[PDB]
Design a protein around this ligand. Structure first.
Ligand SMILES: CCCCCCCCCCCCCCCCCC(=O)OC[C@H](COP(=O)([O-])OCC(O)COP(=O)([O-])OC[C@@H](COC(=O)CCCCCCCCCCCCCCCCC)OC(=O)CCCCCCCCCCCCCCCCC)OC(=O)CCCCCCCCCCCCCCCCC
Ligand SMILES: CCCCCCCCCCCCCCCCCC(=O)OC[C@H](COP(=O)([O-])OCC[N+](C)(C)C)OC(=O)CCCCCCCCCCCCCCCCC
Ligand SMILES: CCCCCCCCCCCCCCCCCC(=O)OC[C@H](COP(=O)([O-])OCC[N+](C)(C)C)OC(=O)CCCCCCCCCCCCCCCCC
Ligand SMILES: CCCCCCCCCCCCCCCCCC(=O)OC[C@H](COP(=O)(O)OCCN)OC(=O)CCCCCCCCCCCCCCCCC
Ligand code: SF4
Ligand code: SF4
Ligand code: SF4
Lengths: 112, 76, 94, 115, 114, 155, 176, 207
């Protein structure tokens, strides 16, 4: 086990593989409540499964960080927490719905 | 003391310079009798808050347009 | 530069360094205040032929932005993940 | 008399210098000059408002410890007693108990300032 | 004519916010005169407060009223916390400014400004 | 002769005041860096008796070293007013002199002489540390020319 | 590549633990710091004896402005107003008209030295080397008005400083 | 091979285009336009209602991770009915990339405060309110930050004059600093610099 993650305020995780399986599984369950054809569901399920496959395949924490390519394993866990929080918020926002409103005629015309 | 409550309320009115004590009565309407406008009414209400010592939220104050209506509100 | 031997030894001993070799006051080692005139080079556009400005006009090659989507499959990231930094072989630990 | 003369001279000279300082220079008094200083902006509230003391417990302890030195100052004279067995014991007893109280206040976090 | 509101759905809600701000300013004038040590009286301070409210009495847009109340509250927080100085509080009174005429003839003599 | 005595006494007080000038620790922007360089070893203003002190009560000179904004103007006037007399002001750099390169700004005072009287104007953006040192020595010679007691005598 | 500035594990052998005990009780690292200020006491200081000695400058130095002439004494300035156009501070004001002869010359040429940022763009912009920033930096004044230079003041500056100015341009013009 | 011309980087342009439409696919409810500049900067143009969903997605999404708000500012374009353009410049350390998110508002329409997403936005939004008058809803503490106390107006608006309306001086009669209508001993000289010949045909607008 590492002595430190090197980032102030990010504590070393005793059981990183177990924590990552729990978080990715929670993300996938939350994604199951998003509409099937929503792009957020399709892309996030795709990337979440890929990371989950690496977590199962590779038991060595040093080697797992090499595959995931997302920093320290504690940075990966934090990112999975962030994604899980985002998924819950996306359900209430529902950004897969059509555009709320077109902008005025030349709102984005530069130069004027 | 409903009698005194009238006594104290009218005491305040007599000082509010824009209110002429000559034309005031317990049933005068601040707008159509004394000729005051809204922010005068707000100042009058704030005087009664000082004299009696309890809040009058804006919802309640904007109905008190006659001295009697203040007297009645004070009772409650 | 004019300090006596004893004072040189005293202040060298006090600081723990050899101060005389790296004096913070400048003497004769600095450049002369009168220098020979320069003769500066010319840039690559100094040519008498094969030098039409339209072929080396940076401003006129700038284009308006490319519209990707207007309101009129594998997931991607803005770029590949950043490669992890390596410890200095020069001196990993200060 | 020597001592009272020395004390009178010291404070008289100090008073004389203050008198010169106040009566010799040219004065120009107005409101803005004599207003309280606070880095260019007017102070917020009075400077007589309560100022929290975070070392209040140490300050009270200072009282009890300051009386110990009054009890320990006579020790150079106490060393002249023939009954040296008793004084040494009692001298050491007092200091040890002073050390014990410091250890007790230290361990109980009395020396740490409140937040 | 469908727009996003700031605070008030309509002008009756807005006027409730305006009355509340007037009370806060009215209560504050006695303290401001004391803390800042002003040579004006409390009546003068309250008259100035009243004057500032009446210059905007013709607004009919709740969003515009919401903003004036928002700005009026920041203005008040600056005063209560003494972030303002005496100079900022007295800028409302324009003491050093000479009176500009309003009649035609006086304007005619001084210059060309309408 | 009273004339001779007051003449000598002006020399004494003038010499004391110009030989012990204590500037307020007061700086606003870029030009404060050159002021720091004047305190640095190469020029060592302290060798002239010029010592920075933070308190206005213990200061003789305000060096206005940098841009004066409208927001800072009351504060600068406050600390100038709180200086005991005699007091002097040195305006340092284009910003303090007349607004400089923010002259047309809505938030900038167009010269610190709108707020305080100024004894010496030091030009530059920023003036070199040596240009400021020249300005301080020019203030010393101005103080050396003061005729307070001679004028008092002839009143 | 990166390095760690403060990531050390201290030795716990008896010698290292006693060396730290002596340091704490005997203040060895505090005495070492006294030695360093002692060593400066016996160094020669860096102070120069201003105004008898001066800080070194180079030919490029941007100081007080001056208007220059040709060797014949004719003004170099032709009232082209390029310096006025480029001035970042709008510190230059110019008026011009045909002189009594046919020459194109200025009737007004002002520099507000309290607007100027001493940036040197005016001398870069000038096509005839008429306006320059000279080497003078000792022109502090007692009044603000003395820093609002009109054409007479600037021509006097050029006549006053031309000997030094021409030599400085001679040293630097091949870099321009 | 052209010493004076800035080289193109078509790899980065390709990557940013792909990500730009990836964001448009996930957030269609809000995204109104996506473009990539010739110097390879990606801009997302969104409906103002989507400031929180869009910024939250960019911060938290595993393929975004724009954990740093580099800059937040406004631009005033008086010719538009929504004259103020709000610009978010974000940086993703994980993917060593930057993205710009833009929205719009007018003088009376509030924009949602993004302090819940980026605590860095607290002072940036006070500056926008101070210098442009854009109101940010649910800001923990919205007040002027740069202008003098009691200052009136929003100086960075294009119709606010360069020198403002008031100036300060010390008045001896009242013994305080006073504010008075601005008079300039020398008026700022407006220059007409634009050449009447078109410089960049690539940006010509239809007649
Ligand atoms: C009470 C104490 C004061 C009373 C005792 C007065 C002592 C005599 C002072 C003479 C100093 C001037 C020497 C000299 O000839 O001028 C050189 C100078 C020309 O020489 P230079 O070429 O420019 O530079 C000399 C060295 O090369 C560059 O300088 P340097 O760094 O190489 O030093 C040279 C010399 C300079 O020192 C001296 O000559 C005097 C030493 C007195 C030490 C007292 C302590 O010192 C030495 O040669 C080494 C031995 C000196 C003792 C060192 C002891 C150090 C302290 C111990 C270390 C730990 C400290 C804790 O001429 C002058 O400018 C004369 C100016 C007058 C100076 C003031 C002298 C009077 C002082 C006040 C008297 C009492 C009132
Ligand atoms: C009480 C007794 C204190 C008397 C001290 C008198 C100071 C002597 C003095 O002025 O120093 C020389 C000074 C030196 O002149 P200075 O101050 O102008 O020198 C300028 C700085 N240098 C030399 C480096 C360029 O002489 C005077 O200035 C004349 C003032 C005489 C003071 C009046 C005496 C009565
Ligand atoms: C450690 C102990 C050290 C103590 C040192 C004590 C000081 C020793 C040096 C004394 C030198 C002589 C002191 C004169 C200082 C007088 C102050 C002054 O300049 O006031 C000017 C004033 C100016 O007077 P004035 O009447 O011309 O103008 C002042 C009035 N207003 C403000 C309206 C302009 O002169 C005097 O006060 C009288 C001078 C008499 C000299 C005796
Ligand atoms: C045979 C039986 C004999 C019995 C007796 C035997 C005992 C002998 C050995 C006893 C120990 C001797 C030293 C005792 C002096 C006090 C030492 C001390 O307390 O210093 C430590 C103190 C704490 O600092 P710190 O390291 O941060 O904290 C430690 C853990 N909390 O840190 C400090 O105090 C640092 C103080 C900082 C300020 C210092 C500024 C001046 C430094 C230069 C002073 C040089 C001393 C010159 C003395 C002049 C003498 C007249
Ligand atoms: S005068 Fe120049 S250097 Fe000094 S504060 Fe102004 S801009 Fe900065
Ligand atoms: S040096 Fe710069 S600011 Fe000064 S006059 Fe020349 S161009 Fe203008
Ligand atoms: S000084 Fe030079 S740039 Fe300026 S108007 Fe004269 S010739 Fe033109």
């Amino acid at each position: 086990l590492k002595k430190t993650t090197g980032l102030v305020g990010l504590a070393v995780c005793e059981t990183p593989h177990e924590r990552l399986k729990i978080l990715y599984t929670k993300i996938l369950d939350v994604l199951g409540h998003i509409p099937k054809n929503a792009a957020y569901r399709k892309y996030t399920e795709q990337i979440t499964n890929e990371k989950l496959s690496m977590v199962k395949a590779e038991p060595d924490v040093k080697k797992l960080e090499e595959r995931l390519q997302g920093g320290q394993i504690e940075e990966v866990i934090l990112q999975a927490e962030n994604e899980l929080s985002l998924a819950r918020k996306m359900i209430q926002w529902k950004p897969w719905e059509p555009l709320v409103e077109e902008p005025p005629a030349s709102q984005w015309k530069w130069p004027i | 003391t409903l009698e005194g409550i009238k006594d104290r309320v009218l005491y305040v009115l007599k000082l509010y310079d824009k209110i002429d004590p000559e034309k005031l009565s317990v049933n005068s309407h601040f707008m159509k009798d004394l000729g005051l406008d809204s922010l005068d009414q707000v100042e009058i209400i704030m005087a009664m808050e000082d004299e009696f010592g309890f809040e009058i939220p804006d919802i309640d104050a904007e109905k008190l347009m006659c001295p009697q209506e203040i007297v009645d509100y004070i009772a409650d | 530069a004019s300090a006596t031997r004893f004072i040189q030894w005293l202040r060298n001993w006090a600081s723990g360094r050899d101060l005389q070799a790296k004096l913070q006051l400048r003497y004769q080692e600095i450049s002369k205040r009168t220098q020979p005139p320069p003769k500066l080079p010319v840039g690559p556009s100094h040519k008498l032929s094969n030098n039409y400005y339209c072929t080396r006009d940076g401003r006129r090659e700038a284009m308006p932005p490319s519209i990707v989507m207007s309101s009129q499959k594998k997931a991607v990231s803005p770029a590949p993940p950043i490669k992890r930094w390596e410890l200095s072989q020069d001196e990993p630990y200060l | 008399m020597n001592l009272m003369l020395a004390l009178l001279t010291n404070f008289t000279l100090a008073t004389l210098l203050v008198i010169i300082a106040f009566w010799l220079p040219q004065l120009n008094v107005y409101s803005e000059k004599t207003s309280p200083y606070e880095c260019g902006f007017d102070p917020m509230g009075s400077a007589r408002l309560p100022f929290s003391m975070k070392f209040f417990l140490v300050a009270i302890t200072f009282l009890l410890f300051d009386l110990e030195i009054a009890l320990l100052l006579p020790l150079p004279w106490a060393s002249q007693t023939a009954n040296l067995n008793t004084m040494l014991t009692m001298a050491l007893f007092l200091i040890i108990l002073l050390a014990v109280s410091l250890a007790y206040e230290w361990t109980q976090k009395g020396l740490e300032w409140t937040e | 004519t469908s727009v996003k509101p700031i605070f008030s759905r309509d002008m009756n809600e807005a006027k409730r916010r305006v009355r509340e701000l007037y009370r806060a300013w009215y209560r504050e004038v006695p303290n401001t005169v004391h803390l800042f040590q002003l040579d004006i009286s409390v009546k003068q301070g309250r008259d100035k407060v009243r004057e500032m409210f009446k210059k905007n009495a013709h607004i009919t847009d709740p969003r515009v009223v919401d903003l004036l109340v928002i700005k009026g509250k920041m203005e008040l927080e600056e005063t209560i916390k003494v972030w303002k100085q005496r100079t900022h509080v007295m800028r409302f009174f324009h003491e050093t400014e000479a009176p500009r005429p309003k009649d035609f003839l006086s304007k005619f003599y001084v210059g060309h400004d309408p | 002769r009273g004339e001779y005595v007051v003449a000598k006494l002006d020399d004494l007080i003038n010499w004391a005041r110009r030989s012990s000038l204590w500037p307020m620790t007061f700086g606003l922007a870029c030009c404060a860096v050159e002021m720091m360089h004047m305190a640095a070893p190469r020029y060592d203003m302290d060798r002239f008796g010029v010592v920075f002190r933070a308190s206005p009560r213990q200061s003789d000179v305000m060096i206005v070293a940098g841009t004066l904004t409208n927001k800072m103007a009351p504060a600068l006037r406050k600390v100038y007013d709180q200086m005991p007399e005699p007091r002097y002001v040195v305006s340092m750099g284009s910003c303090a002199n007349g607004g400089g390169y923010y002259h047309y700004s809505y938030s900038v005072v167009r010269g610190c002489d709108r707020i305080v009287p100024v004894d010496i104007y030091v030009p530059g953006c920023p003036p070199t540390a040596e240009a400021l040192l020249y300005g301080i020595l020019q203030l010393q010679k101005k103080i050396k020319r003061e005729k307070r007691l001679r004028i008092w005598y002839r009143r | 590549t990166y390095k760690y500035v403060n990531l050390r594990e201290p030795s716990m052998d008896m010698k290292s633990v006693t060396d730290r005990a002596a340091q704490t009780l005997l203040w060895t690292e505090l005495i070492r710091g006294l030695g360093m200020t002692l060593s400066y006491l016996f160094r020669e200081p860096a102070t120069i004896n201003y105004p008898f000695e001066k800080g070194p400058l180079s030919p490029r130095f941007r100081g007080e402005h001056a208007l220059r002439r040709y060797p014949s004494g004719e003004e170099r300035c032709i009232a082209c107003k390029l310096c006025e156009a480029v001035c970042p501070a709008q510190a230059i004001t110019i008026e011009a008209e045909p002189r009594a002869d046919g020459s194109r010359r200025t009737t007004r040429y002002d520099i507000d030295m309290t607007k100027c940022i001493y940036c040197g763009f005016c001398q870069e912009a000038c096509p005839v080397d008429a306006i320059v920033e000279g080497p003078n930096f000792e022109f502090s004044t007692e009044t603000h008005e003395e820093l609002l230079y009109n054409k007479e003041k600037l021509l006097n500056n050029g006549d006053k400083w031309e000997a030094e100015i021409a030599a400085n341009i001679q040293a630097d013009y091949l870099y321009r | 091979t052209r010493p004076t011309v800035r080289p193109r980087n078509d790899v980065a342009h390709k990557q940013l285009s792909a990500f730009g439409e990836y964001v448009a696919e996930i957030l269609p409810k809000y995204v109104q336009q996506v473009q990539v500049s010739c110097f390879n900067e990606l801009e997302i143009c969104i409906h103002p209602d989507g400031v929180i969903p869009v910024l939250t997605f960019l911060r938290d999404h595993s393929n975004a991770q724009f954990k740093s708000l580099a800059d937040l500012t406004a631009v005033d374009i008086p010719t538009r009915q929504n004259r103020f353009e709000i610009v978010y410049n974000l940086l993703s350390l994980r993917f060593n990339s930057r993205i710009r998110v833009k929205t719009y508002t007018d003088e009376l329409t509030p924009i949602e405060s993004s302090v819940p997403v980026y605590k860095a936005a607290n002072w940036y939004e006070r500056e926008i309110w101070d210098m442009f008058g854009v109101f940010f809803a649910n800001h923990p503490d919205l007040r002027r930050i740069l202008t003098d106390y009691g200052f009136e107006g929003h100086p960075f608006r294009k119709d606010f004059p360069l020198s403002g309306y008031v100036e300060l001086r010390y008045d001896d009669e009242v013994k305080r600093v006073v504010a008075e209508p601005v008079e300039l001993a020398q008026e700022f000289r407006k220059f007409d610099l634009n050449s009447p010949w078109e410089a960049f045909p690539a940006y010509r607008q239809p007649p």
